[PDB]
Amino acid sequence: SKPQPIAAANWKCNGSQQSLSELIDLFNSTSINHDVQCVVAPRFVMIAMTKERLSHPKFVIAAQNAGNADGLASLKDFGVNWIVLGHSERRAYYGETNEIVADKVAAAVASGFMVIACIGETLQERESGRTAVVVLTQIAAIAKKLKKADWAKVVIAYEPVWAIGTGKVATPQQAQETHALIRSWVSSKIGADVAGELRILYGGSVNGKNARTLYQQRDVNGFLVGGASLKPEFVDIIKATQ
């Protein structure tokens, strides 16, 4: 049976204090009837106001990236206990190595954070048939820096770069193939119980209309949402996870 689903909002640099405060009031006033962990990641300079205003018991606040000693101590002091590491984008755009993100996941877990690590291929890798190789390389790099017990604090988000902000969502079939491959590797290499309890979320052009038929697939455990998370339809994406 599936582990607890997650619905995560990444606001990037978008929204004013007023527009974001309207979304928070909507979230606060929503009755959620099933078991789900909801996550909101505001820009750094909006973390304090979000902290003060967000009250729903099924919601936690996350930071948008954390590159060690430095900012981890600061975020921990401020009450923030989740981080979202956007590696598929940073790799594609700037050349960020797989070892860098692996080291960040390990350092965050050792400081007590829950971590959503975003892994994924480029348009060019997908078209050349290399999705499996690319994705398996990323998960393997992360695993090298972890011990078995650490996996309880890790969540994977499959976020192919061609689906981010483009309007081109993966089909339920494409998401299921990738999620199944990741889980299979984890079962063989790390352990069968670890694999069964791992959350694997899908991200890239998720919306209120397409979320339900993505969630039905065997190995999909929730969503990472960018553009549509700045809109009332985020509540529909939460409801799609049952």
From Swiss-Prot:
One Gene Ontology term from the biological process aspect of the record: gluconeogenesis
Known catalytic reactions: D-glyceraldehyde 3-phosphate = dihydroxyacetone phosphate
Cellular location(s): Glycosome
Top enzyme category: isomerase
Pfam family, one: TIM
Molecular function terms, GO-annotated: triose-phosphate isomerase activity
EC number: 5.3.1.1
Pathway(s) of this molecule: Carbohydrate biosynthesis; gluconeogenesis; Carbohydrate degradation; glycolysis; D-glyceraldehyde 3-phosphate from glycerone phosphate: step 1/1
Signal peptide span: none
Entry's Gene Ontology cellular component terms: cytoplasm; cytosol; glycosome
Active-site residue numbers: H87, E159
Keywords, ordered alphabetically: Gluconeogenesis, Glycolysis, Glycosome, Isomerase, Peroxisome
Major location category of this protein: other
CDD domains linked to this entry: TIM (cd00311)
Residues where substrate binds: N10, K12
Other comments on record: The enzyme contains a high proportion of positively-charged residues in beta-barrels V and VII (compared to the homologous regions in other triose isomerase sequences). Since 2 clusters of positive charges located at precise distances on the molecular surface are common to 4 glycosomal enzymes, it has been speculated that this might represent a signal for entry into glycosomes.
Xref: HAMAP family: TIM_B
Subunit structure: Homodimer.
Protein family per UniProt: Belongs to the triosephosphate isomerase family.
The protein's name: Triosephosphate isomerase, glycosomal
Source organism (scientific name): Trypanosoma brucei brucei
